[PDB]
């Protein structure tokens, strides 16, 4: 039924190799200002503890979440408590060392995200991501590029949102 149910996850997805810092490069979504976004991923059993840091008007904001394991390796679930609804996530493609293509589903809508260990992203990966977006029935105009400058990865106690 759900569009993400048919998206194939990374074979034998290894959270240990996926751990660390990832930079958000772009998002393909029919939904809807992009802020420099960094993720800090840490394995927690079968789940992954994820802190997202976003730079807004010179201030770094952190959001702590727990990506729960939904059974199949590489498939995760983000809870909903006061915001909107459940978000399903699948790490579809990654080499762990340079890029990751993730798919997300919110309210039945499928989006695609590209993350990188460092900038710039290779031409092959950028083109590959574009190909995946097209295959997801989205247009190039629905691809939003995020900042390549102004990243942050540390927030003070007054700018931390714990959703766990």
mmCIF file of N, CA and C in Angstrom, residues 67-138:
data_model
loop_
_atom_site.group_PDB
_atom_site.id
_atom_site.type_symbol
_atom_site.label_atom_id
_atom_site.label_comp_id
_atom_site.label_asym_id
_atom_site.label_seq_id
_atom_site.Cartn_x
_atom_site.Cartn_y
_atom_site.Cartn_z
ATOM 1 N N UNK A 67 15.684 6.650 15.790
ATOM 2 C CA UNK A 67 15.162 5.956 14.620
ATOM 3 C C UNK A 67 15.017 4.494 15.027
ATOM 4 N N UNK A 68 13.769 4.086 15.321
ATOM 5 C CA UNK A 68 13.550 2.713 15.731
ATOM 6 C C UNK A 68 13.565 1.741 14.570
ATOM 7 N N UNK A 69 14.039 0.528 14.831
ATOM 8 C CA UNK A 69 14.119 -0.524 13.824
ATOM 9 C C UNK A 69 12.738 -1.147 13.614
ATOM 10 N N UNK A 70 12.245 -1.155 12.375
ATOM 11 C CA UNK A 70 10.925 -1.734 12.108
ATOM 12 C C UNK A 70 10.960 -3.192 11.659
ATOM 13 N N UNK A 71 12.114 -3.831 11.815
ATOM 14 C CA UNK A 71 12.230 -5.233 11.450
ATOM 15 C C UNK A 71 13.323 -5.531 10.451
ATOM 16 N N UNK A 72 13.114 -5.107 9.212
ATOM 17 C CA UNK A 72 14.085 -5.328 8.150
ATOM 18 C C UNK A 72 15.236 -4.340 8.296
ATOM 19 N N UNK A 73 16.466 -4.838 8.203
ATOM 20 C CA UNK A 73 17.641 -3.987 8.336
ATOM 21 C C UNK A 73 17.590 -2.828 7.351
ATOM 22 N N UNK A 74 17.744 -1.618 7.872
ATOM 23 C CA UNK A 74 17.724 -0.448 7.021
ATOM 24 C C UNK A 74 16.397 0.278 6.986
ATOM 25 N N UNK A 75 15.385 -0.284 7.641
ATOM 26 C CA UNK A 75 14.062 0.337 7.686
ATOM 27 C C UNK A 75 13.841 0.866 9.098
ATOM 28 N N UNK A 76 13.503 2.147 9.208
ATOM 29 C CA UNK A 76 13.301 2.768 10.508
ATOM 30 C C UNK A 76 12.004 3.553 10.649
ATOM 31 N N UNK A 77 11.692 3.891 11.893
ATOM 32 C CA UNK A 77 10.479 4.625 12.219
ATOM 33 C C UNK A 77 10.743 5.757 13.208
ATOM 34 N N UNK A 78 10.207 6.929 12.881
ATOM 35 C CA UNK A 78 10.316 8.115 13.720
ATOM 36 C C UNK A 78 8.934 8.389 14.316
ATOM 37 N N UNK A 79 8.862 8.415 15.644
ATOM 38 C CA UNK A 79 7.613 8.660 16.368
ATOM 39 C C UNK A 79 7.025 10.052 16.150
ATOM 40 N N UNK A 80 5.785 10.230 16.597
ATOM 41 C CA UNK A 80 5.084 11.505 16.480
ATOM 42 C C UNK A 80 4.389 11.815 17.802
ATOM 43 N N UNK A 81 4.800 12.903 18.450
ATOM 44 C CA UNK A 81 4.216 13.297 19.729
ATOM 45 C C UNK A 81 3.989 14.800 19.860
ATOM 46 N N UNK A 82 2.945 15.297 19.205
ATOM 47 C CA UNK A 82 2.633 16.713 19.281
ATOM 48 C C UNK A 82 2.971 17.509 18.036
ATOM 49 N N UNK A 83 3.611 16.866 17.065
ATOM 50 C CA UNK A 83 3.989 17.543 15.830
ATOM 51 C C UNK A 83 3.017 17.246 14.693
ATOM 52 N N UNK A 84 3.011 16.001 14.226
ATOM 53 C CA UNK A 84 2.127 15.610 13.136
ATOM 54 C C UNK A 84 1.839 14.108 13.141
ATOM 55 N N UNK A 85 2.599 13.354 12.349
ATOM 56 C CA UNK A 85 2.397 11.918 12.274
ATOM 57 C C UNK A 85 3.677 11.115 12.137
ATOM 58 N N UNK A 86 3.535 9.794 12.107
ATOM 59 C CA UNK A 86 4.674 8.892 11.986
ATOM 60 C C UNK A 86 5.440 9.074 10.682
ATOM 61 N N UNK A 87 6.757 8.926 10.758
ATOM 62 C CA UNK A 87 7.614 9.059 9.591
ATOM 63 C C UNK A 87 8.437 7.785 9.421
ATOM 64 N N UNK A 88 8.307 7.150 8.263
ATOM 65 C CA UNK A 88 9.065 5.941 7.970
ATOM 66 C C UNK A 88 10.289 6.345 7.167
ATOM 67 N N UNK A 89 11.412 5.707 7.469
ATOM 68 C CA UNK A 89 12.678 6.013 6.818
ATOM 69 C C UNK A 89 13.360 4.750 6.341
ATOM 70 N N UNK A 90 13.960 4.801 5.162
ATOM 71 C CA UNK A 90 14.675 3.647 4.656
ATOM 72 C C UNK A 90 16.004 4.097 4.066
ATOM 73 N N UNK A 91 17.086 3.460 4.499
ATOM 74 C CA UNK A 91 18.395 3.767 3.942
ATOM 75 C C UNK A 91 18.469 2.811 2.760
ATOM 76 N N UNK A 92 18.245 3.338 1.563
ATOM 77 C CA UNK A 92 18.224 2.524 0.351
ATOM 78 C C UNK A 92 19.578 2.234 -0.259
ATOM 79 N N UNK A 93 20.397 3.269 -0.398
ATOM 80 C CA UNK A 93 21.716 3.108 -0.989
ATOM 81 C C UNK A 93 22.751 3.908 -0.224
ATOM 82 N N UNK A 94 23.909 3.301 -0.022
ATOM 83 C CA UNK A 94 24.996 3.957 0.673
ATOM 84 C C UNK A 94 26.263 3.123 0.554
ATOM 85 N N UNK A 95 27.406 3.797 0.570
ATOM 86 C CA UNK A 95 28.683 3.108 0.532
ATOM 87 C C UNK A 95 29.318 3.328 1.905
ATOM 88 N N UNK A 96 28.561 3.998 2.776
ATOM 89 C CA UNK A 96 28.948 4.321 4.152
ATOM 90 C C UNK A 96 30.065 5.339 4.269
ATOM 91 N N UNK A 97 30.939 5.357 3.270
ATOM 92 C CA UNK A 97 32.106 6.222 3.275
ATOM 93 C C UNK A 97 31.970 7.572 2.582
ATOM 94 N N UNK A 98 30.967 7.737 1.720
ATOM 95 C CA UNK A 98 30.811 9.015 1.033
ATOM 96 C C UNK A 98 29.386 9.527 0.834
ATOM 97 N N UNK A 99 28.423 8.639 0.603
ATOM 98 C CA UNK A 99 27.061 9.096 0.343
ATOM 99 C C UNK A 99 25.999 8.163 0.882
ATOM 100 N N UNK A 100 24.784 8.690 0.992
ATOM 101 C CA UNK A 100 23.645 7.887 1.419
ATOM 102 C C UNK A 100 22.371 8.463 0.803
ATOM 103 N N UNK A 101 21.544 7.583 0.253
ATOM 104 C CA UNK A 101 20.274 7.974 -0.335
ATOM 105 C C UNK A 101 19.200 7.374 0.554
ATOM 106 N N UNK A 102 18.434 8.245 1.193
ATOM 107 C CA UNK A 102 17.370 7.817 2.085
ATOM 108 C C UNK A 102 16.003 8.189 1.543
ATOM 109 N N UNK A 103 15.013 7.357 1.840
ATOM 110 C CA UNK A 103 13.642 7.637 1.433
ATOM 111 C C UNK A 103 12.839 7.814 2.700
ATOM 112 N N UNK A 104 11.923 8.772 2.685
ATOM 113 C CA UNK A 104 11.085 9.031 3.843
ATOM 114 C C UNK A 104 9.629 9.099 3.431
ATOM 115 N N UNK A 105 8.749 8.652 4.317
ATOM 116 C CA UNK A 105 7.325 8.700 4.036
ATOM 117 C C UNK A 105 6.595 9.364 5.196
ATOM 118 N N UNK A 106 5.814 10.387 4.871
ATOM 119 C CA UNK A 106 5.032 11.123 5.858
ATOM 120 C C UNK A 106 3.647 11.333 5.259
ATOM 121 N N UNK A 107 2.615 10.861 5.951
ATOM 122 C CA UNK A 107 1.241 11.006 5.476
ATOM 123 C C UNK A 107 1.071 10.444 4.068
ATOM 124 N N UNK A 108 1.712 9.309 3.814
ATOM 125 C CA UNK A 108 1.610 8.662 2.519
ATOM 126 C C UNK A 108 2.413 9.286 1.392
ATOM 127 N N UNK A 109 3.162 10.345 1.690
ATOM 128 C CA UNK A 109 3.962 11.017 0.669
ATOM 129 C C UNK A 109 5.425 10.592 0.744
ATOM 130 N N UNK A 110 5.979 10.180 -0.393
ATOM 131 C CA UNK A 110 7.367 9.731 -0.455
ATOM 132 C C UNK A 110 8.343 10.821 -0.887
ATOM 133 N N UNK A 111 9.413 10.980 -0.113
ATOM 134 C CA UNK A 111 10.455 11.956 -0.418
ATOM 135 C C UNK A 111 11.794 11.235 -0.453
ATOM 136 N N UNK A 112 12.775 11.850 -1.108
ATOM 137 C CA UNK A 112 14.107 11.267 -1.251
ATOM 138 C C UNK A 112 15.162 12.267 -0.790
ATOM 139 N N UNK A 113 16.116 11.800 0.005
ATOM 140 C CA UNK A 113 17.162 12.678 0.505
ATOM 141 C C UNK A 113 18.561 12.176 0.219
ATOM 142 N N UNK A 114 19.456 13.114 -0.076
ATOM 143 C CA UNK A 114 20.849 12.800 -0.338
ATOM 144 C C UNK A 114 21.730 13.382 0.763
ATOM 145 N N UNK A 115 22.528 12.514 1.379
ATOM 146 C CA UNK A 115 23.466 12.930 2.414
ATOM 147 C C UNK A 115 24.871 12.584 1.957
ATOM 148 N N UNK A 116 25.850 13.327 2.459
ATOM 149 C CA UNK A 116 27.238 13.103 2.103
ATOM 150 C C UNK A 116 28.147 13.207 3.326
ATOM 151 N N UNK A 117 29.270 12.494 3.297
ATOM 152 C CA UNK A 117 30.216 12.560 4.411
ATOM 153 C C UNK A 117 31.014 13.858 4.325
ATOM 154 N N UNK A 118 31.169 14.358 3.102
ATOM 155 C CA UNK A 118 31.904 15.594 2.871
ATOM 156 C C UNK A 118 31.538 16.182 1.515
ATOM 157 N N UNK A 119 31.825 17.469 1.338
ATOM 158 C CA UNK A 119 31.537 18.154 0.081
ATOM 159 C C UNK A 119 32.847 18.402 -0.659
ATOM 160 N N UNK A 120 32.815 18.360 -1.994
ATOM 161 C CA UNK A 120 31.639 18.114 -2.830
ATOM 162 C C UNK A 120 31.249 16.649 -2.991
ATOM 163 N N UNK A 121 30.016 16.447 -3.445
ATOM 164 C CA UNK A 121 29.490 15.118 -3.721
ATOM 165 C C UNK A 121 30.003 14.806 -5.124
ATOM 166 N N UNK A 122 30.275 13.537 -5.413
ATOM 167 C CA UNK A 122 30.774 13.177 -6.737
ATOM 168 C C UNK A 122 29.694 13.409 -7.791
ATOM 169 N N UNK A 123 30.117 13.633 -9.033
ATOM 170 C CA UNK A 123 29.169 13.856 -10.120
ATOM 171 C C UNK A 123 28.261 12.639 -10.271
ATOM 172 N N UNK A 124 28.855 11.456 -10.157
ATOM 173 C CA UNK A 124 28.124 10.203 -10.282
ATOM 174 C C UNK A 124 27.001 10.091 -9.256
ATOM 175 N N UNK A 125 27.286 10.467 -8.015
ATOM 176 C CA UNK A 125 26.276 10.382 -6.970
ATOM 177 C C UNK A 125 25.182 11.426 -7.159
ATOM 178 N N UNK A 126 25.561 12.634 -7.563
ATOM 179 C CA UNK A 126 24.570 13.680 -7.797
ATOM 180 C C UNK A 126 23.626 13.253 -8.915
ATOM 181 N N UNK A 127 24.200 12.748 -10.001
ATOM 182 C CA UNK A 127 23.403 12.295 -11.130
ATOM 183 C C UNK A 127 22.548 11.099 -10.727
ATOM 184 N N UNK A 128 23.106 10.230 -9.889
ATOM 185 C CA UNK A 128 22.373 9.061 -9.429
ATOM 186 C C UNK A 128 21.169 9.469 -8.604
ATOM 187 N N UNK A 129 21.375 10.437 -7.720
ATOM 188 C CA UNK A 129 20.293 10.932 -6.885
ATOM 189 C C UNK A 129 19.206 11.511 -7.779
ATOM 190 N N UNK A 130 19.607 12.311 -8.760
ATOM 191 C CA UNK A 130 18.633 12.893 -9.682
ATOM 192 C C UNK A 130 17.830 11.789 -10.375
ATOM 193 N N UNK A 131 18.506 10.705 -10.748
ATOM 194 C CA UNK A 131 17.836 9.587 -11.408
ATOM 195 C C UNK A 131 16.826 8.948 -10.454
ATOM 196 N N UNK A 132 17.182 8.828 -9.177
ATOM 197 C CA UNK A 132 16.261 8.239 -8.210
ATOM 198 C C UNK A 132 15.049 9.135 -7.990
ATOM 199 N N UNK A 133 15.264 10.446 -8.004
ATOM 200 C CA UNK A 133 14.166 11.384 -7.826
ATOM 201 C C UNK A 133 13.171 11.233 -8.981
ATOM 202 N N UNK A 134 13.690 11.159 -10.202
ATOM 203 C CA UNK A 134 12.845 10.999 -11.385
ATOM 204 C C UNK A 134 12.066 9.686 -11.293
ATOM 205 N N UNK A 135 12.736 8.631 -10.839
ATOM 206 C CA UNK A 135 12.103 7.323 -10.709
ATOM 207 C C UNK A 135 11.045 7.305 -9.606
ATOM 208 N N UNK A 136 11.104 8.296 -8.719
ATOM 209 C CA UNK A 136 10.151 8.412 -7.623
ATOM 210 C C UNK A 136 8.973 9.283 -8.049
ATOM 211 N N UNK A 137 8.896 9.565 -9.345
ATOM 212 C CA UNK A 137 7.814 10.369 -9.902
ATOM 213 C C UNK A 137 7.842 11.827 -9.433
ATOM 214 N N UNK A 138 9.046 12.355 -9.238
ATOM 215 C CA UNK A 138 9.236 13.739 -8.818
ATOM 216 C C UNK A 138 10.024 14.465 -9.908
#
